[PDB]
């Protein structure tokens, strides 16, 4: 199962001239395109070696698309100051995420399209892709405007059309790093503590793609709120890392079990110390 996802952000900077508009594109967990309005002569650039041999007609079309969006977000930004009556002195943040989840058989499972203002949800396209969900009475103004204007339809057409078509195309050119599943390197480590007991940390290194669960068990029972867990972090080699740890009594470190589930694991691992 593959996905093509785009993350868009525009942030205002009062006094500090025009706001910053940027776009980052991903396939699965792999970055491949970038946009930044603070670069002089703002144009679209490749962020993965396997995409750069797309042609100029592609990039120019992508420069055209972004710059067009750059305008909508400046205009959208000022509208936010009236829906909410906020100062024209402070800077604000508007977010946007759109993409598609596609099964290996070319069929999609889910498509996203959704906006967030000042770090909080705002409006979002529903799973069924037909009506909008507005967060508040400031966001519901937009709903009516876009329902009458039949906005939802055009949005739906990208997801169903171009997104699927270009993912199938993307997936044939960068298959070296995209069509790959690399297994986790797991183990458990022991660390004595000043407080008199022990910290057991479970490791999972070098796996790809990035979806993974790490878990601790005390003879079959899970200690979720007892473990401390970091977020999945990139190792920078196309692979990822993660760990989770618990605190156990000296002498009972071997009663606790650690499990790792991933695509790169034919059968789910089980580890102890």
């Amino acid at each position: 199962s593959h996905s093509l996802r785009y993350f868009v952000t525009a942030v205002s900077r009062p006094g500090f001239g025009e706001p910053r508009y940027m776009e980052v594109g991903y396939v699965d967990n792999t970055e491949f395109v970038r946009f930044d309005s603070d670069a002089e002569n703002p144009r679209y650039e490749p962020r993965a070696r396997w995409i750069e041999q797309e042609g100029p007609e592609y990039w120019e079309r992508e420069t055209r698309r972004a710059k067009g969006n750059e305008q909508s977000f400046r205009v959208d930004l000022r509208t936010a100051l009236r829906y909410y009556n906020q100062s024209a002195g402070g800077s604000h943040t508007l977010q946007w995420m759109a993409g598609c989840d596609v099964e290996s058989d070319g069929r999609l499972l889910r498509g996203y399209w959704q906006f967030a203002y000042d770090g909080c949800d705002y409006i979002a396209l529903n799973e069924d892709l037909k009506t909008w969900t507005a967060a508040d009475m400031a966001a519901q103004i937009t709903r009516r405007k876009w329902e009458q204007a039949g906005a939802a339809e055009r949005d739906r057409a990208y997801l169903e059309g171009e997104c699927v078509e270009w993912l199938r195309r993307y997936l044939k050119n960068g298959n070296a790093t995209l069509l790959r599943t690399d297994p986790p390197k797991a183990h458990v480590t022991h660390h004595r503590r000043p407080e008199g007991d022990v910290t057991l940390r479970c490791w999972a290194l070098g796996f790809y793609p990035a979806d993974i669960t790490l878990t601790w068990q005390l003879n079959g029972e899970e200690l979720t709120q007892e473990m401390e867990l970091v977020e999945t972090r990139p190792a920078g080699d196309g692979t990822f890392q993660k760990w989770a740890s618990v605190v156990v009594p000296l002498g009972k470190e071997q009663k606790y079990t650690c499990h790792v589930e991933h695509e790169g694991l034919p059968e789910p691992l089980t580890l102890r110390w």
Partner: protein, 99 residues
């Protein structure tokens, strides 16, 4: 204001003295977006550091990665210092190689 960053300092591979590596300062889960991230070796700033992986936590909190090529030595100390609006003063996090 609106979420406090979660800073991690680590290397691509488990470190070995004398063998080239990459130092990652992974800063995540914050808001607002504007943020500054410096890498420090023995207290002085390191000149060229690259920025990657800007995203949203499916709940919109931001993510950003800082990385650098380096060679672990027994006598040198690494750290990443990050200043955010939710934070009173810039937080410096030190690399510990034995996690």
């Amino acid at each position: 204001i609106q979420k406090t960053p979660q800073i991690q300092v680590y290397s691509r591979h488990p470190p070995e003295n004398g063998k080239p590596n990459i130092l990652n300062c992974y800063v995540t889960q914050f808001h607002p977006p504007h943020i500054e991230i410096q890498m420090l070796k023995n207290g002085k700033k390191i000149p060229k550091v690259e920025m990657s992986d800007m995203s949203f936590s499916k709940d919109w909190s931001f993510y950003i990665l800082a990385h650098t090529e380096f060679t672990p030595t027994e006598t040198d100390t690494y750290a990443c210092r990050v200043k955010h609006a939710s934070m009173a003063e810039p937080k410096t996090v030190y690399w510990d190689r034995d996690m």
